[PDB]
């Protein structure tokens, strides 16, 4: 055998997480089975190379005899390559909480910042529950109020440059074990058009987790277990009319309201069986919505080079993912219609994406 002190044993036992390094057997199995843990009988510590605690291995008796066949406490072959690889896999898992370094971001409309102001703590506790760890004050920004020219292209561009400014400064704050940028923990509560621009700013090609505000559960997921709802599709009819995509997710949009604001519209509908305002039970719902949506958008874009007119009844989190989805190099024109308080809540064009 190989002589070792108690500290050296406790170091080896700890760095290896109590598993044999060659076969992976959990050497703490006896304690788990209610038996006394004989640390010295259930495992042998020896050097990883023939002949520091960093070069000592933890082996089950069965594997020790296999690699130390002369019973001289030293391996016959140089097992340092496998040994270091083992410790590295353990180190990576043990440090995994480092990957939770995240940036809180709460984007609200001035209306909701005065009605349902989201406190940063509500997002931080929801983040903490999922292993997302903030390290500084969260970003809390409100969409600027539109001026005389309304929410023209300049307005929407300044909103994008503002959000991208705020997130780019914090994303520079790299850390962890590999210098990665922190994750973005983002929640939005604003009109659908503004939340789409929030998605346009953040994209979907970075470690970012969308959170959803709920009247009762706050930003905690009402049911991480719920199965995402089916996203059913109704294809558009034959014709030359303007192509309209109706999203009936939060509520069933009356197709009559869509053709009233867009006469002759060719209506394509993406819905869930029973629309409900709280249908965002967990983040997997948001992902499922994206997948189903992009599949249909590819089908609709193939049906026309003309703009796709969107009439959406979707929760806030889905409005963001929608916007984020449309951040590829490819860009098709989408004309976002929203119920306009200035026109009796009738659908009117609010935002144009892409060319």
Ligand X SMILES: Nc1ncnc2c1ncn2[C@@H]1O[C@@H]2COP(=O)(O)O[C@@H]3[C@H](O)[C@@H](COP(=O)(O)O[C@H]2[C@H]1O)O[C@H]3n1cnc2c(N)ncnc21
Instruction: Provide, rounded to whole angstroms, the least separation between the CB of residue 319 and a copy of itself.
Output: 12
In the bound state, the residue with its beta carbon closest to Mg ion is 68
Contacts of 151 (CB under 8 A, 6+ apart): 193, 350, 351
Residues 127, 99 contacting (CB under 8 angstroms): no
- CB contact burial 276-296 (16+ within 10 A = b; e otherwise): eeebbbbbebbebbbebbeeb
Taking CB within 5 to 8 Å according to partner kind, which of Mg ion, a copy of itself, Zn ion, none is near residue 43?
A: Mg ion
Nearest distance in Å: CB 44, a copy of itself = 16
Residue 330 lies near ligand X (rule: CB under 6 A): yes
* Tokens coding 6: 């108690």
CA-closest candidate to residue 314, choices 282, 266, 272: 272
Tokens found for residue 271: 């819905």
**What is the footprint of ligand X within residues 202-241 (CB under 6 A)?**
204-205, 213, 215
Residue 205 partner contact from ligand X, Mg ion, Zn ion, none using kind-dependent CB cut-offs of 5 to 8 Å: ligand X
Is residue 63 involved in binding Zn ion (CB under 5 A)?
yes
Give the residue among 270, 265, 275, 332 at the shortest CA–CA distance from 295.
Answer: 270
Place of tokens 């449309």: 326
Closer of 43 and 272 to ligand X (Cβ): 272
The two structure tokens encoding residue 226: 């719920």
Query: Could you tell which of a copy of itself, Zn ion, Mg ion, none binds residue 172, using a CB distance below 5 to 8 A set by kind?
Result: a copy of itself
Assess 212 for contact with a copy of itself (CB under 8 A). no
- Structure tokens given for 119: 């406190």
Residues in contact with Mg ion, shown as a per-residue x/- string from 54 to 93 under the rule CB under 5 A: -----------x--x-x-x-x-------------------
Instruction: Name which of residues 247 to 286 contact ligand X (CB under 6 A).
Output: 250-251, 253-254, 277
Residue 315 binds which one of Zn ion, ligand X, a copy of itself, none, with CB within 5 to 8 A depending on kind?
ligand X
Q: Which residues have a Cβ under 8 Å from the Cβ of 76 and sit 6 or more positions away?
A: 50, 67, 68, 69, 70
Residue 155 is assigned to a ligand binding site: no
Alpha helices in the chain (DSSP H): 6-15, 29-32, 61-67, 80-94, 112-115, 120-129, 153-171, 192-202, 255-261, 283-301, 316-325
Q: Is 168 annotated as a binding residue?
A: no
Which of a copy of itself, ligand X, Mg ion, none lies near 10, with the C-beta cut-off 5 to 8 A by kind? a copy of itself
Count of H helices and E strands in the chain? 11, 13
The answer on whether 6 is annotated among ligand-binding residues is no
Report whether 23 belongs to an annotated binding site.
yes
Q: Does 127 bind ligand X (CB under 6 A)?
A: no
Site for a copy of itself in 1-40 (CB under 8 A): 7-8, 10-11, 13-26, 28, 30-39
Asked whether the beta carbons of 102 and 128 are under 8 A apart, the reply is no
49/154 Cα distance (integer angstroms): 67
Annotated binding residue at 32? yes
**Closest of 267, 264, 241 to residue 255, by C-alpha:** 267
**Residue 184 DSSP one-character state:** E
Q: For residue 256, give every residue at least 6 positions away whose Cβ sits within 8 Å of its Cβ, in sequence order, or none.
A: none
At its nearest, how many Å lie between Mg ion and the CB of residue 32? 5
Report the residue number, 22 or 192, with the smaller CB distance to Zn ion: 22
Residues placed in the known binding site for Zn(2+) = 20, 23, 60, 63
Query: Using CB under 5 A as the criterion, which residues of the chain lie in contact with Zn ion when the complex forms?
Result: 20, 22-23, 60, 63
Residues placed in the known binding site for Mg(2+) = 32, 41, 64-65, 68, 70, 72, 74, 76
Query: Using CB under 5 A as the criterion, which residues of the chain lie in contact with Mg ion when the complex forms?
Result: 32, 43, 65, 68, 70, 72, 74
Query: Using CB under 6 A as the criterion, which residues of the chain lie in contact with ligand X when the complex forms?
Result: 116, 189, 191-192, 195, 204-205, 213, 215, 250-251, 253-254, 277, 298, 313-316, 319, 328-330, 339
Residues placed in the known binding site = 20, 23, 32, 41, 60, 63-65, 68, 70, 72, 74, 76
């Amino acid at each position: 055998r190989f002589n070792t002190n108690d500290e050296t044993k406790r170091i080896v036992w700890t760095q290896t997480a109590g598993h044999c390094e060659l076969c992976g057997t959990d050497l703490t199995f006896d304690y788990r089975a209610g038996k006394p843990m004989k640390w010295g009988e259930v495992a042998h510590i020896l050097p990883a190379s023939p002949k520091d605690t960093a070069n000592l291995m933890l082996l089950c008796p069965g594997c020790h005899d296999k690699i130390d066949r002369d019973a001289d406490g030293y391996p016959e072959n140089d097992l340092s390559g496998l040994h270091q690889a083992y410790l590295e896999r353990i180190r990576l898992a043990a440090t995994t909480p480092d990957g939770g370094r995240a940036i809180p971001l709460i984007v609200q409309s001035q209306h909701f910042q005065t009605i349902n102001d989201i406190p940063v703590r509500d997002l931080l506790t929801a983040m903490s529950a999922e292993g997302l760890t903030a390290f500084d004050q969260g970003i809390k920004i409100a969409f600027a109020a539109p001026g005389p020219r309304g929410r023209d292209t300049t307005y929407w561009q300044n909103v994008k440059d503002s959000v991208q400014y705020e997130l780019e400064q914090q994303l520079k704050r790299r850390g962890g074990t590999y210098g990665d940028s922190p994750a973005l923990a983002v929640v939005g509560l604003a009109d659908i058009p503004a939340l789409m621009m929030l998605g346009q700013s953040i994209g979907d090609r970075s470690k970012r987790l969308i959170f959803s505000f709920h009247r009762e559960h706050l930003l905690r997921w009402p049911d991480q277990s719920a199965e995402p709802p089916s996203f059913l599709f109704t294809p558009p009819p034959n014709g030359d009319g303007p192509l309209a995509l109706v999203l009936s997710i939060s509520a069933q949009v009356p197709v009559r309201d869509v053709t009233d604001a867009l006469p002759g519209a060719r209506i394509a509908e993406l819905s869930i069986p029973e629309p409900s305002y709280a249908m965002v039970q967990n983040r997997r719902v948001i992902h499922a919505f994206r997948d189903a949506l992009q599949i249909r958008l590819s089908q609709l874009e193939a049906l026309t080079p003309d703009p796709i007119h969107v009439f959406a009844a979707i929760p806030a989190a889905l409005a963001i993912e929608f916007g984020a989805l449309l951040t590829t190099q490819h860009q098709h024109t989408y004309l976002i219609f929203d119920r306009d308080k200035e026109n009796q809540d009738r659908f009117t064009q609010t935002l144009q994406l892409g060319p």
